[PDB]
Chains A and B, each alone.
Chain A
Amino acid sequence: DIYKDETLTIPKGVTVDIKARNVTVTGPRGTLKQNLRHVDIEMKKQGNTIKFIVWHGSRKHNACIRSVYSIINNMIIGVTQGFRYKMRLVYAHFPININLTENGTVVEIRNFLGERITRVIKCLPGVTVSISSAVKDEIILEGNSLENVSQSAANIKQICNVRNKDIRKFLDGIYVSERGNIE
């Protein structure tokens, strides 16, 4: 074909700007900046919407068109509604210690199966994690950038990752159950 267009309506967020080849997406919760070098695609603004166009190309570039459409929409969800995820811990005999430091950025984790290894989980830039108080053994992490938020908890899931034991009997550990917006 000669055209491949997909447009998403811009919400009431503060900025849907794409100037200078960068995604400076600012909303009501805050401002987010991201590099727009995923692929040379036509980001065109039309009033209250931003149109993504891939004109006169093949599928190898056209398949990446929907990714930026999702990535901007993912940034739009963080700019407008944000992201708030809750991770649930499981303790059977030795409770796993957890200490939020640097406004919840430096997560001092210990006593995973009673181990003396000091597990320091440094949060990604722009995300704040906290121990949820409603449900025990629950950690609530929220932020604007969902990609940095999701990768941090996955890193937290990879922090106290069980090894050198049978996964069946040894089953208590760190898990993620709630993954949703901040609004």
Chain B
Amino acid sequence: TSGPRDNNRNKWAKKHLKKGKRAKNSNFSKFLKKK
């Protein structure tokens, strides 16, 4: 596994957060901001 301040569990996550959740969140708040 890894630890709290483990870069190995954090370096790949930043590349994993580039795709996946980030664009869906941008798609989530767009309709939320719509009146």
Contact = CB atoms under 8 A, between A and B. Distances in A.
Nearest to B12: A117
Nearest to A117: B12
Contacts of A120: 15
Contacts of B15: 118, 120
Interface string A115-149: 00110100000000000000000000000000000
Sorting the interface of chain B by its residue count into under 10, 10 to 19, 20 to 34 or 35 or more gives under 10
A30 to B, nearest CB: 31
Interface in B6-35: 12, 15
A153 to B, nearest CB: 21
B20 to A, nearest CB: 13
Interface residues of A, number: 3
Nearest to B15: A118
A120 B12 CA distance: 11
A84 B35 CA distance: 56
A120 B15 CA distance: 9
A50 B12 CA distance: 48
B22 to A, nearest CB: 16
A135 B15 CA distance: 32
A117 B15 CA distance: 10
A75 to B, nearest CB: 33
B14 to A, nearest CB: 10
A117 B8 CA distance: 12
Nearest to A118: B15
Contacts of B12: 117
Interface in A80-123: 117-118, 120
3 contacts: A117-B12, A118-B15, A120-B15
In the A-B complex, the 3 residue pairs with the closest CB atoms: A118-B15, A120-B15, A117-B12
